[PDB]
Design a binder for this molecule. Sequence first.
Ligand SMILES: Nc1ncnc2c1ncn2[C@@H]1O[C@H](COP(=O)(O)OP(=O)(O)OP(O)(O)=S)[C@@H](O)[C@H]1O
Ligand SMILES: [Zn+2]
Length: 239
Amino acid sequence: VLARKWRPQTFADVVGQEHVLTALANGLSLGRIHHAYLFSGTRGVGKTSIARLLAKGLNCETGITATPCGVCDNCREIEQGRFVDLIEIDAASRTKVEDTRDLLDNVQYAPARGRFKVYLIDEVHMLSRHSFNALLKTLEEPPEHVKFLLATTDPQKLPVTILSRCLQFHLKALDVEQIRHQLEHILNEEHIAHEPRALQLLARAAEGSLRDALSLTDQAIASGDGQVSTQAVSAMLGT
Ligand SMILES: Nc1ncnc2c1ncn2[C@@H]1O[C@H](COP(=O)(O)OP(=O)(O)OP(O)(O)=S)[C@@H](O)[C@H]1O
Ligand SMILES: [Zn+2]
């Protein structure tokens, strides 16, 4: 679907989180790396995308950069989600509760391939109290070669002892114009027909989320004869 196909592959592909992208790039470019990053914000605004690019910028074979090359093996594997040094943890999953608990109790201090062992934790506020302390403990005695990239829609639900040990970045819900322009850009690249009004209606219905925006666009295309027209979208949205 559009959402997976148009996942940001470079900071330049990211829509509207400038204040965050400028700080991450400055830090990366000057070799100033903190041990833990926290990305907060609502739904589908780009938290995981940015965390993933940061992990990519940190392990690029080309060197620590704010512009991962995107063609080296480390970059390709991270992209595929099959990189040995990018350990993805989902605190919100009912199914991976043990793996979540175990991996955090057994941090692998030495990367096997890349220069850093990276942990990316989704919805970190949903971790058990046990794991919170496991994490805290690691953030208190920062293993080198190991970086923690946390994401969450509710930073406040997080123990202040942990929040305090991260570099916090607050992502904003995206503007109607920010979303509208991205949809237009994507549809132009896909060579899919669209009408101005139709895109305005989808951007508005997305209500701040680029992911919901792409999901609504994919539904529009599928139910509207392989195109995005004002008439078909209005009917679909109940305009
Ligand atoms: N700022 C953005 N710029 C460009 N595309 C984006 C942006 N935010 C979201 N997208 C699209 O939305 C999809 C999901 O975005 P994510 O980065 O996973 O959002 P998120 O903020 O982590 O959302 P959750 O998991 O619901 S909290 C991506 O694969 C993109 O196609
Ligand atoms: Zn690379």
